[PDB]
Amino acid sequence: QPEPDMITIFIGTWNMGNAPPPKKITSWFLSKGQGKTRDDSADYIPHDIYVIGTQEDPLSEKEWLEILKHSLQEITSVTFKTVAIHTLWNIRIVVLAKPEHENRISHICTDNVKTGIANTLGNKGAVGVSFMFNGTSLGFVNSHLTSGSEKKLRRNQNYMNILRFLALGDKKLSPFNITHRFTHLFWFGDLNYRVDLPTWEAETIIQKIKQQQYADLLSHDQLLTERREQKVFLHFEEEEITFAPTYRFERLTRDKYAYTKQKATGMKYNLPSWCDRVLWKSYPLVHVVCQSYGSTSDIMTSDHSPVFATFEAGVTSQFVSKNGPGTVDSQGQIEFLRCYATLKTKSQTKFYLEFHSSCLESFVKSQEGENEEGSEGELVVKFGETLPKLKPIISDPEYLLDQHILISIKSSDSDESYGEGCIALRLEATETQLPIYTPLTHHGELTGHFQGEIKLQTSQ
């Protein structure tokens, strides 16, 4: 039975509004309702992995798992296996997978982050799950960020705390946060970004929604605008939104947005907003295609509608050769030529590189680079032709061209990373000098760039 080169992944996010769900929620898992929806002809075809994020979830783990499993069984006639479940307060993540994947899934990690301090610590934060699916690392984050139209900066701070402190994936990748640890990272939740229009425009916004005219609303969505200004979710993707705002509804119908200030809202307006989102970040040149992104119309127990997104995602096999794993394959090598880092830092320490990859036995430290002053005030760290030759464990091009090299640039003085990036080995040619490039980030913010040339030797 051959190993897959693709899987499909369902991502769900639902703020349940502290209310139990209705008896039928199959529309969510079928990607039916508004937006980019799934074809009826696929309804019986199970996804490989279902990842369910809830917020304001009033159920026990047992109660929600029973509902999820019985839902998927009704749809697919498959009894899904529980990969992981993790809850922080009323924020929950469930990962289910087809039984045939049980022996493909390993290295399961869970963690949470609590955001805020004192007043603002006690209900917001994130839960996450990571695991290996054969040769491919998968990370999943469900976050409930700070609420309120006037708190977009707080949400951006919540995001940075979550990506710094959520401990998922391979702990040997010590310079790297979750935005570099995974082949595919999915980040979803009640991100709580609002449509930033005046309160007086509430009825005009409602009109626009009834006409399915979302363009003038999305142009004011705080998540889109903050992402355009590189304030949050740098280097993440989001499918185009073609569904109505998923908040704030009167419960038990979808006919009414409940936006007016009430004692129950702390006298805050809740203009219709796309609070409930799914974003992703995959390593360069790995296949990932969003095949649905939408909201249900028929689940009305909460003041939020459920959101679904589905993806085709490239996966690789757990490669064995006569040589690697447990030795090198002299026939393979990775060379870096004419490489330099450009850093936004004011620091004048010397820097070195670390090269991390599951195609290496262990990470590789470079010699210190040569600092020069760049014209426009920046630091340029030149490595020229000094970088070590990397010795992959397997030289077969079917393996090596699918791999990635994580790069950290570190201070000689403090051994702290000033920037992290990723280079694909999915090259146009082997035994040929080719340009490479990655932006460098630290704590998920832009700190520089790394560019140069690569020369990859495979067994072919």
Ligand X SMILES: COc1ccc(NC(=O)Nc2cccs2)cn1
Full 3-state SS string of 405-441: EEEEEEECCCCCEEEEEEEECCCCCCCCCEEEEEEEE
Of 43 and 196, which CB lies nearer to ligand X in the complex structure? Answer: 196
Question: Which residue from 280, 190, 282 is spatially nearest to 237, judged by alpha carbons?
Answer: 280
Position 227 contacts ligand X (CB under 6 A): yes
Of 185 and 364, which CB lies nearer to ligand X in the complex structure? Answer: 185
Position 356 contacts ligand X (CB under 6 A): no
Alpha-carbon distance of 335 to 405, in angstroms, equals 12
Of 92 and 227, which CB lies nearer to ligand X in the complex structure? Answer: 227
Token couple for 211: 């006409």
Position 304 contacts ligand X (CB under 6 A): no
Position 180 contacts ligand X (CB under 6 A): no
Given candidates 235, 304, 356, 442, which one binds ligand X under the rule CB under 6 A? 235
Residue spans of beta strands (DSSP E) within 56-171: 81-88, 91-97, 105-114, 125-133, 136-144
Question: Which residue from 249, 234, 141, 133 is spatially nearest to 185, judged by alpha carbons?
Answer: 141
Q: How far is the CB of 224 from ligand X (least distance, A)?
A: 6
Q: How far is the CB of 227 from ligand X (least distance, A)?
A: 4
Alpha-carbon distance of 61 to 82, in angstroms, equals 11
Q: How far is CA 7 from CA 64, 289, 319, in A?
A: 25, 11, 18
Instruction: Identify which range of 20-28, 120-128, 221-229, 386-394 contacts ligand X by CB under 6 A.
Output: 221-229
Position 104 contacts ligand X (CB under 6 A): no
Helix (H, G, I), strand (E, B) or coil at 66: helix
Q: How far is CA 309 from CA 33, 53, 104, 246, in A?
A: 12, 12, 23, 14
Written as one string, the DSSP assignment of 218-252 is: HTTBHHHHHHHTTSSSTT-B-PPP-S---B-BPTT
Instruction: Identify which range of 104-112, 184-192, 227-235, 340-348 contacts ligand X by CB under 6 A.
Output: 227-235
Q: How far is the CB of 259 from ligand X (least distance, A)?
A: 26
Of residues 130-159, which lie at the interface with ligand X (CB under 6 A)?
none
The mark string for 434-453 relative to ligand X (x by CB under 6 A, - otherwise) is: --------------------
Of 123 and 225, which CB lies nearer to ligand X in the complex structure? Answer: 225
Position 62 contacts ligand X (CB under 6 A): no
Q: How far is the CB of 367 from ligand X (least distance, A)?
A: 29
Position 346 contacts ligand X (CB under 6 A): no
Of 394 and 407, which CB lies nearer to ligand X in the complex structure? Answer: 407
Token couple for 198: 């005046």
Please, are residues 10 and 264 in contact by the beta-carbon 8 Å criterion? no
Instruction: Identify which range of 222-230, 239-247, 375-383, 416-424 contacts ligand X by CB under 6 A.
Output: 222-230
Tokens 């090596």 identify what position? Answer: 400
Q: How far is the CB of 344 from ligand X (least distance, A)?
A: 17
Position 215 contacts ligand X (CB under 6 A): no
Of 8 and 438, which CB lies nearer to ligand X in the complex structure? Answer: 438
Helix (H, G, I), strand (E, B) or coil at 309: strand
For the chain, helix, strand, coil in percent to 5 are 15, 35, 45
Instruction: Identify which range of 164-172, 223-231, 397-405, 407-415 contacts ligand X by CB under 6 A.
Output: 223-231
Given candidates 228, 263, 322, 346, which one binds ligand X under the rule CB under 6 A? 228
| Interface residue list for ligand X (CB under 6 A) | 224, 227-228, 235, 237
